[PDB]
């Protein structure tokens, strides 16, 4: 209650929370890697969610064949499961986050994009699906980043960029790894479970709270602290 009106902020991940992409992510993993010659579930590409496209592939070289990935692996399987992602029906709208963000802004809170994603397709639409919401300078990708989530660096970022200290922002995430960079980062984190996982996971992460999706994390903004 102290720390509501402390609020200048909301910042949210993009695959998961603002569009449902997901789905087509892990099948893309799952693919390309298939396609490589290994074997990356669809859950487990799931639990890399947040990752860089070069961590990902870099850790599940490692786990799988016992050697890094060269740079020239890296940015073919990037380049393929980007294309394999966009070959799919163009990803939609998770329901409530427009409601959401149509809230946070009557707040006057400024809404952030904090994203481990490199997917142009999708960053090229957050104005076409959330118009007047969001902002490259307000915005932090997987362009900006060295290590990325689940690293706080990508959170710590997005705070540098909005002028604002851990206590003026909350962080909307539905991922473990990227719950973790939030609450690493010091800010207050609001889980979404909006994939298959326990939401378990996502408390053992780090989240002070748990919602089961983003409409009903919009239903109960206004109860929140
Ligand atoms: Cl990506
Ligand atoms: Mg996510």
């Known amino acids: 209650s102290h720390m509501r009106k402390k609020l200048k902020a909301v910042l949210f991940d993009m695959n998961g929370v603002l ?16 396609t490589h010659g290994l074997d990356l579930s669809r859950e487990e590409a799931y639990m ?7 961590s990902t592939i870099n850790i599940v070289f490692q786990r799988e064949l016992g050697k890094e990935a060269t740079q020239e692996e890296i940015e073919s399987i990037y380049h393929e499961k980007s294309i394999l992602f966009n070959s799919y029906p163009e990803a939609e709208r998770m329901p409530g986050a427009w409601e959401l963000l149509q809230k946070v802004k009557s707040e006057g809170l400024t809404p952030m994009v904090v994203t481990g994603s490199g997917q142009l397709s999708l960053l090229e639409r957050l104005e076409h699906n959330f118009p007047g919401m ?11 980043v060295k290590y990325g989530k689940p690293n706080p660096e990508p959170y710590l970022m997005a705070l540098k960029k909005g002028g604002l200290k851990a206590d003026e922002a909350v962080v909307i995430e ?17 889980a979404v479970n909006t994939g298959p996982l326990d ?9 002070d709270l748990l919602f089961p999706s983003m409409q009903t994390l919009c239903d109960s903004w206004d109860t929140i602290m």
Not at 19 to 34: D, G, L
Not at 48 to 54: I, K, M, P, V, Y
Not at 134 to 144: P, S
């Open 19 to 34: 569009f449902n992409s997901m789905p087509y992510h892990s099948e893309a993993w799952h693919q390309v890697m298939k």
């Open 48 to 54: 890399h969610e947040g990752r860089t496209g070069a």
């Open 134 to 144: 969001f902002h490259k300078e307000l915005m932090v990708t997987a362009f900006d």
């Open 174 to 190: 539905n991922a473990p790894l990227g719950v973790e960079a939030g609450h690493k980062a010091g800010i207050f984190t609001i």
């Open 199 to 207: 939401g378990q996971v996502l408390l053992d992460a780090g989240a």
